[PDB]
Design a protein around this ligand. Structure first.
Ligand SMILES: CNc1nc2sc3c(N4CCN([C@@H]5O[C@H](C(=O)O)[C@@H](O)[C@H](O)[C@H]5O)CC4)nnnc3c2c2c1CCCC2
Ligand SMILES: CNc1nc2sc3c(N4CCN([C@@H]5O[C@H](C(=O)O)[C@@H](O)[C@H](O)[C@H]5O)CC4)nnnc3c2c2c1CCCC2
Ligand SMILES: CNc1nc2sc3c(N4CCNCC4)nnnc3c2c2c1CCCC2
Ligand SMILES: CNc1nc2sc3c(N4CCNCC4)nnnc3c2c2c1CCCC2
Lengths: 580, 580
C-alpha cells in the first residue's frame, strides 16, 4: 500500500530533488565501497530525471550497468519524535539505497513507488545517502530485455533510466494512516441519482473519524469507523471532461490524511463500455512519459501542456502506454476529467519476432512472479482514481501462443480480485492475433487491438489495407464484446509534404487515419479510437527508426502535425456519450 | 504583331536552346569587340534560363551590368529560298543581337517577344551569333529600379536576367501570314447558342483562304477573304475548367499557319463579372515564373505541374503577376481552361515607400512611353487567347497620388482601343488607397485590391484586422462595380507549427485566410479571391525576407503547406458560376 505523500497537519514533506552527485559504475564500484565514502571525481546530475540524455557522447547515453547517485541528508533532531520515511516514487529498473554506508532498501521495477523507514539508521549530523541504479533488462525484467555488452529492448522505446521520479522524505505519527480505500454504489434510478460510499481505513503502530467535504471545502457528513460507510444524495458524479471531486479527511490517532475522490460507475454491457450507465466512446491516444532532455523523467509542465492539448483537440482518454505513469499525472486526470487506461510494465512478453517459444519454462520468459507483484503494487496505488476505468495487464504479449492462456489467467484473476471496484481487465493485442487465436477473447472484458493496416500491413496500398481491416474487425465482432483500437498510426516526419502522398508525409498520415476511421465507423461494437502516438518519442536506433518513433500526432516538443488538426475536427463532432 | 512560331507545311522551326558560351562583361567588353571574335575564357550557360543561380558565389548572382551569350549558327543554303527570322521570346531587360560582328537588332523589355530577319547578313558556313544582355533597372525601366554599384528593385521579386525564354529560327515564304485576328459574337438567346466569328488575316511581301476545324480535326466550314467572316451554330463554348478549342488553318500564298481559338464572351454588368453571360467567381492565386535553379527561365514541366495542382485544388484562375508569362503557358491555359489575368511589366511605378513624388516629370518615373509600347506589344501577342478575360495595366502604382490619373488614362485608353475583344481593364491597388482616393475607381471595370489585413495591417490581431477589412471593403462597394482581391496572404515557413498560433506558423497562415474569407463572403460584389502567392519565390535579401518570399500556399518546389489543404476544401465547395 502506498499513499501519495502530501502536506497534512499530521505529516511533513521535504523534497530531495536537485543536483546530486553522480558517477557511472566502472565495474569496480561495489568492490570498493563507493556507497560508503563520498563519490570522488563525481559528476552533477539533476534528480528527478532520466540521466541518459543529460550528458554528451554515447558513454552516458548507452551505459550498460550501474550508476551511483549520492546526496547528503540531515533532519532536525526535533523530528525523531515522529516516524521518518524515504519514498522513492520510481528508480528505473533496480534500486539499492545505502545510508551512512549500510543497505537500507532494495527494489525491482522501474515505474512504481517504494519506501523505507529511517528512524533507526538516521544518524545525527550529515548522512551520506546513496542510490545505486541498474539499467540491465532481460527475460526476468518487465519490460523485457531481449538478446538482440549492451541492453537490447524487446520493446519500441528507449531504455531511459536513473531516478525517474522524485525522492522525498515525509513523516508520520507512530500509529498512522497507511491505506484508505473507498468505493461507491450509485442508484441512477432516482431522477436525482445519489450514492453511498464505503470507507475502509487502515492504521499501523485508538480512535479514527472520517470527514467528507465537497469541491469548495464545505463539510457535508461525518462518521467513525476504520471500516464504516457514508451517504450522499444529489451526488455530483465525476464525468469524462466534467470532473467533480469530493474530498475526504481521515483523522485517526493524531494523524490525518486527505484524499480526493470522484463518484462514477464503470460497467461493460454487451458491446457497450458504460461510464455512469452511459455508452462511452474512447477518443484519444497512447502516450509515453517522453520529453527532452528529461528522458522518461517526470515533467509537471508538459503534463499540463499535454492535457491542455487534449482538451483543445477534443479527446477524452489516454493509455499509460507500456508502464504506469507518475502519481501526479494520475491525480491530474482526476482533476481534469481524463479517462485513463492504466497499464503495467509488461511489454516485451513476446519472443516471436531451435526457436524458443515465448512461454517456454526453461528458455523463455521468467516474468510471471514479478508480473504479479506489479499488478498488486499498481492496483494498490491507483485503486481510488476515478480516472482509471480499465486495467491493461500487458502490451502485445504473444497472446496466441502456447503457454499464453496459462500465463495470463492467474494475472487476470489476481487483477479482478484486487480491484475494490471490480473494473474491466484487458490486454492489448499485437498484429497477427484473431478472435479465435487470442487468449484475450476469453480473459478480457474489452478487446483492445493494435492494428497497422496502412503501414506495416499493406502500406502504401490503402485500398488493400482497408479490405484487410474490414475483414479482421468484422470477425472480432462475433465475440459480442466491446472492441477499441489502442494503437494505429503511421511514421510521419513533420515537414514532409506532398500533393500526391508518399509514406512519411504529413499527407499520407492524414489519409491513413481517414481510411481506418471510415471502417471503424461501420461497427457499432467499436467503442474507442486511440491513435499511436500522441507525440514523437525516443527509441533505440535501427534502420526503421527515423531519429526515434515518428508516429506522433505531435512532434516531441508538442507542435501539431497536420493530422492533429484532422483529429481535432473529427473528435469535435463525436460525443463522449451516445456516439452509438 | 507576333505569331507563336509553330511547325507548318509552309514554315520550319529550329530551336537554338542548349549550352551556349557565356562571359560576364568586365566593363571593357564593348570596347574590345567581344561580339566580333569567339568569347575567350568563356563559361557554359544553358539557354533558355535565367543565369543568376546557375553558378556559385555572389559574382554571378549579383552582377551589375552586361553579360555575353554567344553561340554558332549555320543554315542549309537550300533555305535562303525562304525568309529567315530570329525570334527571341524574351531577353530580360535589354537585348542586343550581333551576327558575324554586326548589330542586327535591339530591344527593351524583358518579358515580351521580338524578332529580326537574317536573310541578308546570314553568311555561308558557321556564323557567330552574340546576344548581349543588360540587367540594369531604373526609373526608365518597367519593372522599376529604385535608388535603394547594384540594382535595387522597387518590386518584391529577384532580378533574374539572361535569355529567359527560348531563341528559335523559323522561316516563311516571301509573302507570308503576319497576324491573324479573330473575334466572336454569340447569341445566347437560342436554347442552342451559336456564334459568328470574324477573321482578319494580314500578309506582307495573292489568294488567301480560311479553313475552320473542330477539336478532332473535322473540317466544318471554309471561306476566302483577308477580312472575311464565318458561322458556327451549335457552338462549343470555351468555358472555365471546360475548355473547347476550335482550330483555324489560314492558307494564303504558299503560306499556311494554324491557330486554336475558343468561343466565349466576357462582360461586366454591375457587380457581376460575366463569362458566357454567367456570374463568374475567381478562385486561384497570383503566381510568378519562379523555379529553382531556372530563375524566371521557362519551365514546361513545372507549368504542367502547376496546372495539375490548380485542378487538384479546385482553382480556376491566376494572374500573370508583375509581367507577361511565356506563350507556352498562355496556350496551355487555353487547352486546360484556366482563366488568366494578363498583366504588364509595370510594377514599381510608385516612389511613395525633398521627397520626390511618383509622377514628378523631372525627378519621378520616366516610364509612360515604354508602358505604352508594352500594352501594345502584349495585346498584340495574346489578343486571341480565350483564357485572357481581363488586362492589368500595372501592379500597385501610386494610383492615389497627383499625376496618377494623367499617367494611366492614356494607357487605359490605348488598352481599351487595341483589344479586338474590348475586354475589361484594371490595375491592382496597393494598401492605402480607398474608393475615393483611387484613380482606379474611375478608369477600371473591376476593382482589384491587394490587402494584407492580418499581416502588414494588424497582425497578429486578427480581430482588429477583420474590423479594418470590413470597414474598407464595405466602402469599396459604393462604386457599384465588381471587386476581387488579387493578393492576400501571410509569410509562412513550411514546417513551423503551433497549437496556439504565432506569425510565420502554418497554423497562423490558415487562420489569416479564414478571417479574410469570412469577410469576403459577406459582400455579393466581391467576385474573386486570389491568394498571394501560389508558391514561395526568390526576392532580394532584406531583414523582412526569410530566404525569399514565403507567402506561398506551396513551397518553391510545389509541396503543399497546410493552407493548401484549407483552400482545396473551401474551393471545392464554391462553383465557377452562380456563387452569388
Ligand atoms: C502486416 N504484417 C506486419 N505486422 C507487423 S507488427 C510490427 C511491429 N510491432 C507492432 C506493434 N508495435 C506496437 O506499435 C508501435 C509501433 O510499432 O510503432 C510501438 O511503438 C508500440 O510500442 C507497440 O505497442 C510494436 C512492434 N514492429 N515492426 N514490424 C511489424 C510488422 C510488420 C509486418 C509486415 C512486414 C513489416 C513489419
Ligand atoms: C497596414 N499598413 C501597412 N501596409 C503595408 S503595404 C507593404 C508592402 N507592399 C505591399 C504589397 N506588396 C505586394 O504584396 C506582396 C508582398 O508584399 O509580399 C508582394 O510580393 C507583391 O509583389 C506586391 O504586389 C508589395 C509591397 N511592403 N512592405 N510593407 C508594407 C506595409 C506595412 C504596413 C504597416 C507597417 C509595416 C509594413
Ligand atoms: C513483438 N512485436 C512484433 N510483432 C510483430 S508481428 C509481425 C509480422 N506479421 C504479423 C502479422 N502476421 C504476419 C506476420 N511481420 N513482421 N514483423 C512482425 C512483428 C514484429 C514485432 C517486433 C519486432 C519486429 C517485428
Ligand atoms: C510600393 N509598395 C509599398 N506600399 C506600401 S504601403 C505602406 C504602409 N502603409 C499603408 C497603409 N497606409 C498607412 C501606411 N506602411 N508601410 N509601408 C508601406 C508600403 C511599402 C511598400 C514597399 C516598400 C516597403 C513599404
Amino acid at each position: 500500500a502506498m499513499l501519495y505523500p502530501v502536506l497534512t497537519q499530521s505529516r511533513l514533506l521535504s523534497d530531495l530533488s536537485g543536483v546530486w552527485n553522480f558517477k557511472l559504475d566502472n565495474g569496480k564500484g561495489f568492490e570498493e565501497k563507493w556507497y560508503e565514502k563520498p563519490l570522488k571525481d563525481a559528476d552533477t546530475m539533476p534528480v528527478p530525471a532520466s540521466y541518459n540524455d543529460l550528458k554528451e557522447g554515447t558513454d552516458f547515453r548507452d551505459h550498460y550497468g550501474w550508476v551511483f547517485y549520492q546526496r547528503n541528508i540531515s533532519v532536525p533532531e526535533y523530528v525523531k519524535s515522529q516516524r521518518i520515511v524515504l519514498r522513492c516514487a520510481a528508480v528505473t529498473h533496480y534500486a539499492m539505497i545505502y545510508l551512512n554506508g549500510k543497505l537500507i532498501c532494495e527494489h525491482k521495477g522501474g515505474f512504481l513507488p517504494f519506501e523505507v523507514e529511517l528512524n533507526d539508521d538516521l544518524q545525527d549530523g550529515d548522512n551520506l545517502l546513496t542510490i545505486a541504479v541498474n539499467n540491465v533488462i532481460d527475460y526476468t525484467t518487465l519490460p523485457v530485455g531481449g538478446k538482440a555488452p549492451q541492453n537490447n529492448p524487446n520493446f519500441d522505446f528507449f531504455n531511459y533510466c536513473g531516478i525517474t521520479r522524485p525522492v522525498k522524505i515525509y513523516t508520520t505519527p507512530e500509529t498512522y494512516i497507511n491505506d484508505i480505500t473507498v468505493t461507491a454504489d450509485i442508484d441512477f434510478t432516482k431522477e436525482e441519482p445519489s450514492a453511498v460510499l464505503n470507507y475502509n481505513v487502515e492504521i499501523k503502530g485508538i480512535t479514527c473519524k472520517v470527514e467528507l467535504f465537497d469541491e469548495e471545502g464545505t463539510k457535508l457528513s461525518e462518521t467513525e469507523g476504520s471500516e464504516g460507510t457514508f451517504e450522499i444524495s444529489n451526488v455530483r458524479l465525476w464525468q469524462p471532461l466534467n470532473a467533480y471531486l469530493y474530498k475526504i479527511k481521515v483523522t485517526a490517532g493524531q494523524d490525518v490524511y486527505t484524499l480526493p475522490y470522484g463518484v462514477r460507475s464503470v460497467r461493460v454491457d454487451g458491446t457497450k463500455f458504460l461510464i455512469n450507465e452511459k455508452p462511452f466512446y474512447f477518443k484519444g491516444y497512447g502516450k509515453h512519459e517522453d520529453t527532452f532532455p528529461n528522458g522518461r523523467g517526470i515533467n509537471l509542465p508538459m503534463n499540463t501542456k499535454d492535457i491542455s492539448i487534449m482538451k483543445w483537440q477534443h479527446a477524452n482518454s489516454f493509455r499509460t502506454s507500456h508502464y504506469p505513469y507518475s502519481e501526479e499525472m494520475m491525480r491530474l486526470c482526476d482533476e481534469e476529467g481524463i479517462v485513463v487506461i492504466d497499464e503495467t510494465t509488461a511489454v516485451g512478453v513476446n519472443l516471436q519476432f531451435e526457436r524458443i517459444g515465448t512461454f517456454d519454462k526453461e528458455h523463455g520468459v521468467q516474468t510471471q512472479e514479478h508480473h504479479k507483484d506489479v499488478i498488486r503494487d499498481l492496483i494498490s496505488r491507483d485503486k481510488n482514481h476515478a480516472c482509471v476505468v480499465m486495467w491493461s495487464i500487458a502490451n502485445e504479449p504473444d497472446s496466441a501462443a502456447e503457454g499464453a492462456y496459462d500465463y495470463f489467467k492467474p494475472l487476470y484473476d489476481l487483477a479482478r480480485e484486487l480491484d475494490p471496484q471490480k473494473r474491466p481487465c484487458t490486454l492489448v493485442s499485437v498484429q497477427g492475433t484473431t478472435a479465435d487465436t487470442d487468449c484475450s477473447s476469453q480473459l478480457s472484458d474489452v478487446i483492445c487491438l493494435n492494428r497497422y493496416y496502412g503501414w506495416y500491413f499493406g502500406g502504401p496500398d490503402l485500398e488493400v489495407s482497408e479490405t484487410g481491416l474490414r475483414k479482421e474487425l468484422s470477425d472480432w465482432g462475433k465475440l459480442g464484446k466491446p472492441v477499441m483500437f489502442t494503437e494505429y498510426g503511421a511514421d510521419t516526419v513533420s515537414g514532409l509534404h506532398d500533393t500526391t502522398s508518399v509514406m512519411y508525409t504529413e499527407e499520407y498520415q492524414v489519409e491513413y487515419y481517414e481510411m481506418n476511421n471510415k471502417v471503424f465507423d461501420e461497427f457499432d461494437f467499436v467503442v474507442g479510437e486511440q491513435a499511436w502516438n500522441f507525440a514523437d518519442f525516443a527509441t533505440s536506433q535501427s534502420l526503421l527508426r527515423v531519429q526515434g518513433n515518428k508516429k506522433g500526432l505531435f512532434t516531441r516538443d508538442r507542435k501539431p502535425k497536420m493530422v492533429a488538426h484532422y483529429f481535432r475536427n473529427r473528435w469535435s463532432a463525436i460525443p463522449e456519450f451516445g456516439y452509438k
